Copies of this chain bind each other. A is one copy, B any other.
Amino acid sequence: TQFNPVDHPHRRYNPLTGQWILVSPHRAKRPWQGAQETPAKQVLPAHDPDCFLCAGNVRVTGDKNPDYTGTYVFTNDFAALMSDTPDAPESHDPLMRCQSARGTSRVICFSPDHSKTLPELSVAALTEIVKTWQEQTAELGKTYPWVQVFENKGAAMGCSNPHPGGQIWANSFLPNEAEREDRLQKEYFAEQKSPMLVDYVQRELADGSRTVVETEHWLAVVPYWAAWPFETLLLPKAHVLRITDLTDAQRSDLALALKKLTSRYDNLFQCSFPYSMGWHGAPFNGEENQHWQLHAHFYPPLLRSATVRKFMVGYEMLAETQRDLTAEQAAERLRAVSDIHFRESGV
């Protein structure tokens, strides 16, 4: 038989992590008698008097939020890391070893509007968010080699607070992902003479099967090696080391691409579409970071619909990630919808 990626299971390589992805084209034809997701509520207030994240409201700790009108950043009340944690007793023990961990955690409210998600925000507003991401990265980076910007959107994605926003966690070390991506890029670079993702963006621009968003300065695709159903990879077209390096143009442009990508996401099932996303850029380790290329990852769980998600368990935990749909199928369905939030379009 002729090999048919659409019907034939195969494995794809993720050069960023060095891991394989199992693709099993028809897996989703099976009966689904499992959990049924709960789609988001259609009626929220712009201000929730009981929301710890709302403006002019008191946090769980009694501390009062300012009367913020834009973005708002504050040290997380339950930080995951601290700047002064004492050093751990480090050994060379090949069985049980530990290491120190310092840093901080900040929370960012995208806006005071309790009911407005990224896709529903102005490009201006979005531009503010980027500026904030930048401001945060630069300050923190002055102190920690790894600054991780991220966001958890929706209950299916473990958010513990319903207010629109993200987080930043700084680390004194290079976390798993960062060390891996760092090393792999560096090796590619040393070998190929060019940045791995810079070349990748080129190939994708020329192909288009996996393209979901394209703007002047940005490209969002369902990466070849994507793991989650509708996972996307957001990259600048030009070579950029960190978020702090973007020009104001690439910056306002980013806002636009974000609006587009998130709008498509919500348009996919005509509902708030949950996910975990975050930025990866060169570490502030004072080294040669030429091999780096700034990028954002979007890991959403929804699969068959608004109430049917993908579960990365069982074989996927004990062996390897296994996808039901191809990256090409995913991109296609994403290209199919409008890039204007249904709420904004009125359609």
**Contact surface of A with B, Cβ cutoff 8 Å:** 1-5, 8-13, 15, 19-20, 22-24, 26-27, 29-35, 52, 60, 77-78, 80-82, 84-89, 94-102, 146, 148, 150-152, 155-162, 167, 169, 171, 173, 175-178, 188, 191-192, 196, 199-200, 203, 224-225, 276, 278-280, 297, 299, 310-315, 317-322
**A60 — nearest CB in chain B belongs to which residue?**
B31
Contacts of A278 in B (CB 8 A): 314-315, 317-319
Instruction: Flag if B315 contacts A98 (CB, 8 Å).
Output: no
**A50 — nearest CB in chain B belongs to which residue?**
B33
Specify which of B10, B29, B150 is in contact with A100 (CB 8 Å cutoff): B10
Contacts of A35 in B (CB 8 A): 155-156, 158
Instruction: Flag if B12 contacts A31 (CB, 8 Å).
Output: no
Complex: A318 Cα to B322 Cα, angstroms: 19
Q: Which of A78, A224, A280 has most B Cβ within 10 Å? A: A78
Contacts of A160 in B (CB 8 A): 30-34
Instruction: Flag if A99 contacts B200 (CB, 8 Å).
Output: no
Nearest CB in chain B: distance from A101 CB, A: 5
Since A2-B86, A9-B82, A178-B319 are in contact, a sample of 18 more A-B pairs with Cβ atoms closer than 8 Å, ordered by chain A residue number, is A3-B87, A11-B100, A12-B98, A20-B175, A24-B80, A31-B52, A31-B60, A31-B160, A31-B161, A34-B161, A35-B155, A95-B199, A95-B200, A96-B225, A148-B319, A157-B311, A276-B317, A278-B317
**A171 — nearest CB in chain B belongs to which residue?**
B319
Specify which of B1, B23, B82, B203 is in contact with A86 (CB 8 Å cutoff): B1
Nearest CB in chain B: distance from A309 CB, A: 8
**A105 — nearest CB in chain B belongs to which residue?**
B315
Contacts of A94 in B (CB 8 A): 15, 188, 191-192, 196
Complex: A15 Cα to B95 Cα, angstroms: 6
Instruction: Flag if A318 contacts B82 (CB, 8 Å).
Output: no
Contacts of A157 in B (CB 8 A): 311, 313-314
Q: Which of A146, A156, A167, A315 has most B Cβ within 10 Å? A: A315
